[PDB]
PDB file of C-alpha atoms and ligand atoms in Angstrom:
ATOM      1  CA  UNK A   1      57.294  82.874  45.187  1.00  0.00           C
ATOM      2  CA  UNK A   2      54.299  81.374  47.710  1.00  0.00           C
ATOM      3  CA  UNK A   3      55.050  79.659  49.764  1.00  0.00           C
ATOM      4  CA  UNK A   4      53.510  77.696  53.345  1.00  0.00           C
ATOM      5  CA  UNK A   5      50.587  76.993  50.864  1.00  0.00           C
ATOM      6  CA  UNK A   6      48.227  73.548  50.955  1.00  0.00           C
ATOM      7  CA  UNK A   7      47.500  72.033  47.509  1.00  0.00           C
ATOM      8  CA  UNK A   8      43.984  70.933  47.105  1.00  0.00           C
ATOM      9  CA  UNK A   9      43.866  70.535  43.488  1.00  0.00           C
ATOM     10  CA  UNK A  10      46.384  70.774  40.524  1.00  0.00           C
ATOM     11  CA  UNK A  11      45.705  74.527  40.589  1.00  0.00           C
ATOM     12  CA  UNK A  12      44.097  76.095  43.630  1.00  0.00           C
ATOM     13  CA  UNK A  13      46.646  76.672  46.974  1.00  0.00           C
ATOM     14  CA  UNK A  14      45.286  77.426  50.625  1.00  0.00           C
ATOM     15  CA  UNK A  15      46.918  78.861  53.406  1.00  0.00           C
ATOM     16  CA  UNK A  16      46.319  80.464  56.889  1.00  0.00           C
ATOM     17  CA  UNK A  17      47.557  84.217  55.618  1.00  0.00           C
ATOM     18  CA  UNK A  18      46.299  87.670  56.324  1.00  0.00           C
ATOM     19  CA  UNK A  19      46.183  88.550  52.486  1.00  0.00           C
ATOM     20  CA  UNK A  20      47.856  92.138  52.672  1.00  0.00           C
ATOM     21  CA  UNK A  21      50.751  90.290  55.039  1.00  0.00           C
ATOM     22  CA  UNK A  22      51.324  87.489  51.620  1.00  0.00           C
ATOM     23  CA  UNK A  23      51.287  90.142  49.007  1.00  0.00           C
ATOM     24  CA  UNK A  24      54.006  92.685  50.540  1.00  0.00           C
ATOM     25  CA  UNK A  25      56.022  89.800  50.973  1.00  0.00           C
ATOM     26  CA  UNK A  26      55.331  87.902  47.600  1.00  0.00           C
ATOM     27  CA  UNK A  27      54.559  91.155  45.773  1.00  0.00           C
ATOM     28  CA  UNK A  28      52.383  89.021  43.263  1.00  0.00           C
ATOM     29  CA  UNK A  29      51.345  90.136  39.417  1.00  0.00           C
ATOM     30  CA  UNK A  30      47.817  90.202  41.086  1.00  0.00           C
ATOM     31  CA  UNK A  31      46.042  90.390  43.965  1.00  0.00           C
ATOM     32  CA  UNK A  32      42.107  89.495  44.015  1.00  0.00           C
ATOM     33  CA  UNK A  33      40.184  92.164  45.829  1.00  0.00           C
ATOM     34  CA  UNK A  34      36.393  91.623  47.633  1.00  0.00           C
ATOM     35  CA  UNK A  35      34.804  94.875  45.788  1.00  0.00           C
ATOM     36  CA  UNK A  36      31.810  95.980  46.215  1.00  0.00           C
ATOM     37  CA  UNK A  37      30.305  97.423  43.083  1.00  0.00           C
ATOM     38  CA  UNK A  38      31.297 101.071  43.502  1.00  0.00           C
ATOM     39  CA  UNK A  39      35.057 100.488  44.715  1.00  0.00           C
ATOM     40  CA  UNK A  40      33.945 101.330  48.016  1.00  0.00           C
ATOM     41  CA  UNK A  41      36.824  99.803  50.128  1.00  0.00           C
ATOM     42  CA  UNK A  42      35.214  99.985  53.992  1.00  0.00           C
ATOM     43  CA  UNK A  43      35.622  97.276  55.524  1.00  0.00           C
ATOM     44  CA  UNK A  44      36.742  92.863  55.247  1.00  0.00           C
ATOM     45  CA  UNK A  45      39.214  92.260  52.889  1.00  0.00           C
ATOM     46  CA  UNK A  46      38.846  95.594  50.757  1.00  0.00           C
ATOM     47  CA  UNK A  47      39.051  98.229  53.774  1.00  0.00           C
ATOM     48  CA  UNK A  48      42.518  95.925  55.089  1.00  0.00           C
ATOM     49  CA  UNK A  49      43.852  96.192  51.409  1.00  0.00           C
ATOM     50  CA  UNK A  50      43.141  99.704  50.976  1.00  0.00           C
ATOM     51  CA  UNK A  51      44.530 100.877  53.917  1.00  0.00           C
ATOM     52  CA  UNK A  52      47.465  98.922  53.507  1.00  0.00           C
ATOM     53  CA  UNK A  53      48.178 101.199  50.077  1.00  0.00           C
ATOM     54  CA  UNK A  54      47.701 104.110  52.593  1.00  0.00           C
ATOM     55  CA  UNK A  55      44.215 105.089  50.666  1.00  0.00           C
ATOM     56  CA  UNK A  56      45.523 105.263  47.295  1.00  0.00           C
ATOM     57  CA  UNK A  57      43.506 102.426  46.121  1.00  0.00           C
ATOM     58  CA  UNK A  58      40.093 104.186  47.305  1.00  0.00           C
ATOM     59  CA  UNK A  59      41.849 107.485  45.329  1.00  0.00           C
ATOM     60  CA  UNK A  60      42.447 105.633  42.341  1.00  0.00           C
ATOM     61  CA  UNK A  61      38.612 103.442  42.486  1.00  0.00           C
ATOM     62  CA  UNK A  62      37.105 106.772  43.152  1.00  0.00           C
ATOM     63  CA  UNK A  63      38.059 108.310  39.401  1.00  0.00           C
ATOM     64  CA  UNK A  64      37.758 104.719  38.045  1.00  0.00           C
ATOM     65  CA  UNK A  65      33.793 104.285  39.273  1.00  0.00           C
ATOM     66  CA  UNK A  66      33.699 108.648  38.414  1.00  0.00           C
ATOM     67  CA  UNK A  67      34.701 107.538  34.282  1.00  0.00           C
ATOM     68  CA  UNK A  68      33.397 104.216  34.122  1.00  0.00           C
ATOM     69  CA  UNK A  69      30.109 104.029  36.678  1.00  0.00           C
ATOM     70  CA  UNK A  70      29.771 100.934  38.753  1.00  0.00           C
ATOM     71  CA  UNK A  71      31.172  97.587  38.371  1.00  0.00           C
ATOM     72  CA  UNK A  72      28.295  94.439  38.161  1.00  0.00           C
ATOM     73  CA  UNK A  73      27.510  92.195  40.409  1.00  0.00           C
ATOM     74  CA  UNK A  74      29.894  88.757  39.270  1.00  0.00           C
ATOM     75  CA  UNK A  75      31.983  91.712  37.430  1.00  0.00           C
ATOM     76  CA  UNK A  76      35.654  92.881  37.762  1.00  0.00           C
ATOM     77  CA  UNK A  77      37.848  95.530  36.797  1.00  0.00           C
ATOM     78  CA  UNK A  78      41.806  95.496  36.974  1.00  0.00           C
ATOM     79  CA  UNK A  79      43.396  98.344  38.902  1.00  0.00           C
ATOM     80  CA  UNK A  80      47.100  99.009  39.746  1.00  0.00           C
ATOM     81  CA  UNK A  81      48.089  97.049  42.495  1.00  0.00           C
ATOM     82  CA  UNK A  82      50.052 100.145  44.135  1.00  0.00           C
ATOM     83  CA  UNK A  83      52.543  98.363  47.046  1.00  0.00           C
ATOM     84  CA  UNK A  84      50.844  95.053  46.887  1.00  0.00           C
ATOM     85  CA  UNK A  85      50.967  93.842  43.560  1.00  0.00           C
ATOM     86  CA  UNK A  86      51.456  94.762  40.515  1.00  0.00           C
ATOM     87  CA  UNK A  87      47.690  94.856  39.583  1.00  0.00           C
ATOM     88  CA  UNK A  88      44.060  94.625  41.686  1.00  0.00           C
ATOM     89  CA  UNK A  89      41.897  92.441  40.106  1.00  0.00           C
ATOM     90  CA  UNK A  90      38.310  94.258  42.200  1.00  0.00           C
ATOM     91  CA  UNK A  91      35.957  91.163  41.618  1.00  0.00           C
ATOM     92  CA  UNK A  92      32.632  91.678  42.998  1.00  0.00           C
ATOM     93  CA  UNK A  93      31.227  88.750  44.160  1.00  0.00           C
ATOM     94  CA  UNK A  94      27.707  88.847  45.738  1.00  0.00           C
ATOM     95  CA  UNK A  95      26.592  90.017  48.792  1.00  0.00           C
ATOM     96  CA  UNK A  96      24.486  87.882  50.626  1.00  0.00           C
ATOM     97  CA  UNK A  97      24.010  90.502  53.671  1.00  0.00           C
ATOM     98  CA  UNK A  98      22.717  92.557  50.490  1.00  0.00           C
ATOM     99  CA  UNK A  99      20.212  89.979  48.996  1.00  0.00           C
ATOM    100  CA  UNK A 100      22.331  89.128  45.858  1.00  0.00           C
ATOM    101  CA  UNK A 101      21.833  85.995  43.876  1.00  0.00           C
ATOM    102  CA  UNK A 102      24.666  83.618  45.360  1.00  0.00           C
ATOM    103  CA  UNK A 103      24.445  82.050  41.708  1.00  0.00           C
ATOM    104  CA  UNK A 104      26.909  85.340  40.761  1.00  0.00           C
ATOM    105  CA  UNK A 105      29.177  83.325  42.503  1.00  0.00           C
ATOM    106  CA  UNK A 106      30.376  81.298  39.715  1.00  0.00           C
ATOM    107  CA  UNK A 107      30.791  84.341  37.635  1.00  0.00           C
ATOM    108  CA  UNK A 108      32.447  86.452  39.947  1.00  0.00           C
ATOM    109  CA  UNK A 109      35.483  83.517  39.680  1.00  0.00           C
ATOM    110  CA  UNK A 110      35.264  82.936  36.254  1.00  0.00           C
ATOM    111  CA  UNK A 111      37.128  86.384  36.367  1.00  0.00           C
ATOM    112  CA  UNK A 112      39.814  84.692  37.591  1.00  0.00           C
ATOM    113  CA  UNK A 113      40.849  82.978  34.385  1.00  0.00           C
ATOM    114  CA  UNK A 114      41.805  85.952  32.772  1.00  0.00           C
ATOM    115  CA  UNK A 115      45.370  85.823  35.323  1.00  0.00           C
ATOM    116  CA  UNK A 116      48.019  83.253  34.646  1.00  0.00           C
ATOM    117  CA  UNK A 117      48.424  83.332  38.777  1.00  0.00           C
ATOM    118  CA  UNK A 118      46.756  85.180  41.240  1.00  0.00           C
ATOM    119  CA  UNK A 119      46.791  85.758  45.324  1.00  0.00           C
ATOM    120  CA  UNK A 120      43.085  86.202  46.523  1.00  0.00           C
ATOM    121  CA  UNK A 121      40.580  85.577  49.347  1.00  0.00           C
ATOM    122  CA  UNK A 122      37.523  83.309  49.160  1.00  0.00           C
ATOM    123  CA  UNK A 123      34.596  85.432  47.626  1.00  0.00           C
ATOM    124  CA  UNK A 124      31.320  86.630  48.889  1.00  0.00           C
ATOM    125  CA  UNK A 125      33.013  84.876  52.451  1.00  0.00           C
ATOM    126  CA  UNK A 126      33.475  87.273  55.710  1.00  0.00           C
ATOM    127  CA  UNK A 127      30.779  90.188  55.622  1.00  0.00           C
ATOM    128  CA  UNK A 128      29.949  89.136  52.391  1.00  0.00           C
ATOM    129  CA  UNK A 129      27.547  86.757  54.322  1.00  0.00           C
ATOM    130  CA  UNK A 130      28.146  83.822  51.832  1.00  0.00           C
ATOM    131  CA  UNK A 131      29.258  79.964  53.218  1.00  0.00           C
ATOM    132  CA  UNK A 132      32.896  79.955  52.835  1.00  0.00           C
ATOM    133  CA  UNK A 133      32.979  76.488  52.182  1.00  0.00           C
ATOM    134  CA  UNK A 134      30.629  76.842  49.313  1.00  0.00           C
ATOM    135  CA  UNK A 135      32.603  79.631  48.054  1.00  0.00           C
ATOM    136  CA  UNK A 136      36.154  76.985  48.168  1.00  0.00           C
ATOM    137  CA  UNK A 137      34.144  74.241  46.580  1.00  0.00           C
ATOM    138  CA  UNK A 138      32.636  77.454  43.428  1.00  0.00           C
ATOM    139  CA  UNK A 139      36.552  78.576  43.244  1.00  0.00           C
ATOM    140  CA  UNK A 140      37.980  74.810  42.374  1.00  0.00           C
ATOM    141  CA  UNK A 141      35.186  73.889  40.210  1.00  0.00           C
ATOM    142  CA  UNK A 142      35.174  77.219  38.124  1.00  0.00           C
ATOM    143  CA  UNK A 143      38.803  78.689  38.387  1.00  0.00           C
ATOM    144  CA  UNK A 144      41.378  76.734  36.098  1.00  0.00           C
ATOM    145  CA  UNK A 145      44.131  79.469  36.549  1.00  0.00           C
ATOM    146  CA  UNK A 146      46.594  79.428  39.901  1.00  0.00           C
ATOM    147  CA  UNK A 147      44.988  80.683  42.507  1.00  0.00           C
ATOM    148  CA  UNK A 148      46.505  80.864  45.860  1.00  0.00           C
ATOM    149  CA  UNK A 149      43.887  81.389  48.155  1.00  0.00           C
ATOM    150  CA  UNK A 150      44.598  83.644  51.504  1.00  0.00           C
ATOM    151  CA  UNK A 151      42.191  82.778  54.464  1.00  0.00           C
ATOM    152  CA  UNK A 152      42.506  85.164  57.604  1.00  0.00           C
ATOM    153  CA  UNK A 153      40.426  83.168  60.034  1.00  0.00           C
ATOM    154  CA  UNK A 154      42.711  79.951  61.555  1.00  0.00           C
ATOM    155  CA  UNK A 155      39.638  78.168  62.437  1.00  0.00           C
ATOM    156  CA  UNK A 156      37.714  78.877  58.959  1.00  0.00           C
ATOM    157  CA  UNK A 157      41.264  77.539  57.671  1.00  0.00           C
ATOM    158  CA  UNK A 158      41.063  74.403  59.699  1.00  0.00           C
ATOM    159  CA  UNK A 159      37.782  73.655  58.826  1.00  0.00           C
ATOM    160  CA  UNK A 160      38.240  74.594  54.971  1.00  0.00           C
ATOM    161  CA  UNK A 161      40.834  71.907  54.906  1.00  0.00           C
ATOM    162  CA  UNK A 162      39.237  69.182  57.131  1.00  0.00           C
ATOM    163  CA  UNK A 163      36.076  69.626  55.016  1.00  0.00           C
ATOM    164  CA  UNK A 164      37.510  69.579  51.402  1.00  0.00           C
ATOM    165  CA  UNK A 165      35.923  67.163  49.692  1.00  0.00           C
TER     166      UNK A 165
HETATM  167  N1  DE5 B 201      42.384  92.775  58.641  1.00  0.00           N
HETATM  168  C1  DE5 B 201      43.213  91.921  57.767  1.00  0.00           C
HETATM  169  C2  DE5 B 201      42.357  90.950  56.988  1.00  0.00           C
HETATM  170  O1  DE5 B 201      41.149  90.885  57.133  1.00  0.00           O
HETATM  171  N2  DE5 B 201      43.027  90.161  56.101  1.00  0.00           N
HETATM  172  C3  DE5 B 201      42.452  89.110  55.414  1.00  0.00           C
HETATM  173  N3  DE5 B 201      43.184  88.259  54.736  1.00  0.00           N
HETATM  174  C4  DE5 B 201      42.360  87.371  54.074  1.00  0.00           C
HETATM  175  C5  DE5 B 201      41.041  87.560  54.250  1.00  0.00           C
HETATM  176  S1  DE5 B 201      40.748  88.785  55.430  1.00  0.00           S
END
């Protein structure tokens, strides 16, 4: 199972992890993607992801967001996981780069409590624009499931822990 991982509360874990690096070696139920509303898998967390699955993510988003249209802002959809995990759980949370109402914050985690356990990065963090340790302090105060959280940066890490009230 995880493992390395700091516990800050009874249910949310922390670790210094590059996310696709702790789900080909955990192979979770579900890994947490950082969507964007039409799948579009670029760049941060969701371009590292996809390319990890060798583009068949973007394939498979592609004739997802083709049937179903876009996801919303604070929304989710749950995709197959292809060599990561078994499933993709594509929360959009919002982009402040973009203008969105950081308030979709709390939403876009409350997705989270529809998965027993899940790997995932800190949302609307990285080029998502939002404070990462305002998006810590959302996750522990909304998410109730396990969530082991997978932060890239060592020095975002260091002071995510140092700070954690
Ligand atoms: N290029 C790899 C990468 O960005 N991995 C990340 N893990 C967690 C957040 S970002």
């Amino acid at each position: 199972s995880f493992s390395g991982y700091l516990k800050l509360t009874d249910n949310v874990y922390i670790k210094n992890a590059d996310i696709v690096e702790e789900a080909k070696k955990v192979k979770p139920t579900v890994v947490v993607n950082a969507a964007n509303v039409y799948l579009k898998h670029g760049g941060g967390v969701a371009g590292a992801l996809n390319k990890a699955t060798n583009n068949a993510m973007q394939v498979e988003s592609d004739d997802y967001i083709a049937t179903n249209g876009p996801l919303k802002v604070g929304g989710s959809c749950v995709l197959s996981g292809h060599n990561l995990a078994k499933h993709c759980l594509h929360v959009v949370g919002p982009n402040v780069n973009k203008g969105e109402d950081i308030q979709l914050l709390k939403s876009a985690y409350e997705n989270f409590n529809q998965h027993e356990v899940l790997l995932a990065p800190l949302l609307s963090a990285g080029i998502f624009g939002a404070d990462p340790i305002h998006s810590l302090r959302v996750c522990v105060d909304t998410v109730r499931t396990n969530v082991y959280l997978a932060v890239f940066d060592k020095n975002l890490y260091d002071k995510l822990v140092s700070s954690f009230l």
